[PDB]
Design a protein around this ligand. Sequence first.
Ligand SMILES: [Ca+2]
Ligand SMILES: [Ca+2]
Ligand SMILES: [Ca+2]
Ligand SMILES: [Ca+2]
Ligand SMILES: [Cl-]
Ligand SMILES: [Cl-]
Ligand SMILES: [Cl-]
Ligand SMILES: [Cl-]
Ligand SMILES: [Cl-]
Length: 775
Amino acid sequence: QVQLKDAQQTDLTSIQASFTTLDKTEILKELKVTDKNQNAIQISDITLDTSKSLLIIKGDFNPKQGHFNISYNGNNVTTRQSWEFKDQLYAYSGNLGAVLNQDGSKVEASLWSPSADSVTMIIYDKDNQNRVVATTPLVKNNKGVWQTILDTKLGIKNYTGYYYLYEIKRGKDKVKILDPYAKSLAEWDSNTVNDDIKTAKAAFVNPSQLGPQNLSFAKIANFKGRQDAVIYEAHVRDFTSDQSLDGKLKNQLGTFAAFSEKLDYLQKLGVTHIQLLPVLSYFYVNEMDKSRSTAYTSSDNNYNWGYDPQSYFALSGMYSEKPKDPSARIAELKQLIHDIHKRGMGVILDVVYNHTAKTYLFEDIEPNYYHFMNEDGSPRESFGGGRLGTTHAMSRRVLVDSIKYLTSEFKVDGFRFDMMGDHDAAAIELAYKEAKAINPNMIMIGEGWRTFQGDQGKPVKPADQDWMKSTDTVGVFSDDIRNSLKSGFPNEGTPAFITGGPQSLQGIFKNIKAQPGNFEADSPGDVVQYIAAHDNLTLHDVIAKSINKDPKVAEEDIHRRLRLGNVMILTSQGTAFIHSGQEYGRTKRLLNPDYMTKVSDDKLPNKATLIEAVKEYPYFIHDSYDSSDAINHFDWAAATDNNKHPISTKTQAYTAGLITLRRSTDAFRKLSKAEIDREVSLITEVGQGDIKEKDLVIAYQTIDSKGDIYAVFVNADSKARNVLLGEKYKHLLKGQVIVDADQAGIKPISTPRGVHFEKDSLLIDPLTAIVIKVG
Ligand SMILES: [Ca+2]
Ligand SMILES: [Ca+2]
Ligand SMILES: [Ca+2]
Ligand SMILES: [Ca+2]
Ligand SMILES: [Cl-]
Ligand SMILES: [Cl-]
Ligand SMILES: [Cl-]
Ligand SMILES: [Cl-]
Ligand SMILES: [Cl-]
């Protein structure tokens, strides 16, 4: 029953051969090894691993005479190079990609592909991307890097704006690939994909020549660390796709250039960093269709969040006014970023190295290497594409080089990693080190969910929530504070602190101190505090679902609860995170006539959540990645029109004032856990007055470096509550109210609403937040 299955070369003198089973003399009989020309190779020794049913074969296996044929009883298999051995032989540290000279007369090009028989560049007309104008063969060096220099010989005087693909030949097969180090691309429409050309085309550009030449990193006032960041998460389309802006907007809707026209709002709002959803090239899109999708739908829209990665260096053409000009988008993003920096803010880019849109994107270039792999060599896959194996040297280069390019070229102030837990901690550490070396004020965050897969049977320390106890570099989202305050996975819509579900106050209090219960944070900067984001139901919609009330009659109550949530996030230690629209009560309700009322299970709308109490239009979208502009647009009237929308504008002014408070004092922005435990204390301890172990009211006190004292009270109960102060906190009765039921800020409120001062206690109205300051 002993039969040879496969084999891999792992170093210069070693080959591992896998068998069906191994249950030494009798096998060094039958086993024979030959080179690429069928010539016999001497076996120095063998070792049997009966547990793994693999045979380790020793000898002199020169890879230049490879690959080797291993044979046993009629089975003949060809050796595959392991990724570790491919790194040993081919790991390259030189320049990759295509570089134009100053006047555009010459391009120096480089592509890494060590297993290729030949590599040919195909060049396409800048003014007609389907028109082939030239082809030229590249030459391979010792590290498997194919190179050429484009010049007058191809009949082209200036290569600027021209497009290119690489045709790689390995034996009988030929395939056309996209330069992974491409700095721009031809206008892209995924409908044009066929069997021959199935990627966008790279473009010849000179990034350094484009955009404002004095582009610099952010200058954020009183920003001394990741704990001082107040991050605002926006999608470039969403932020300016409102029909309300038609006739306002000097630039085209949903572009970098339009986004800049609304930065004053964000400057006033008070956020420090603007986080943009994926601006790098994504696959499922038609960039030549900028039309607004006006019907309320949750599927089959040109709209895309951008989590279908095509390139890690080249920007998407979707947010460019001139997608057919590959230089424009580089200039347009630089200008937006310069406009952000001018207003005292920073920019953070959402980046998606965990997976690609299509496994072939990298697998066509070099097989059995770039992706995390199964033991048979096949690529591990995720979300319809390939899992980038960032423990592998050239895959790690792609991540780190793109982070360095984006940082230094676009002067980016931070990065957010999608599914950071898919990655090894070493790659993200290195990315941080390199980024921080360029930009000393660099900050990084990411989704640290425990999702790691990696290479089969090759465990590695992942960059997830458990990494936080062994690093003070990248911070992770706190799902614990999210869930405890307003629900989330696996139980979205379940009553929680601000939605009528009593929670353990110690757990809430520890979250407020940046000490979540589901992972160890040894520093407050490890924790990104949030209750909403682009994913899942909006804060408004999840509140309405959780309490089961129709916004048509309960708009006011929903916003009272929403404001409590924003108070808690903006007075909690760590890094504060706000979803775009969280400030006004953004909604994703499906206002489609076909879903005026509850429909059958068979005809359910995609990615929608039913709120039973709603009479007309009961479905709300919890995953709007493929939803229309009608669903996804930022509602500017709701955000800024005081007369037409008094409730949402009151909520946004409330949120703006909470941001001012937060930035006004380091009481809410402490550096260490040590000082947090010593200087942030729980007023509502279990047994003080009517406070129970699980409850809906909480109060806490913090002190700043000037020792100024700030006390925050949140009554999330539906009845009034007396909060006991006693001899310990009686000094608070002499303080000034700076946040009440109606307004938030840093100035004393002369006649505060929702609170009454007693002898040694405070009487607080239902669904009311109070903040007192003692100078
Ligand atoms: Ca302000
Ligand atoms: Ca063009
Ligand atoms: Ca830490
Ligand atoms: Ca879509
Ligand atoms: Cl462009
Ligand atoms: Cl989630
Ligand atoms: Cl509402
Ligand atoms: Cl929201
Ligand atoms: Cl309103």
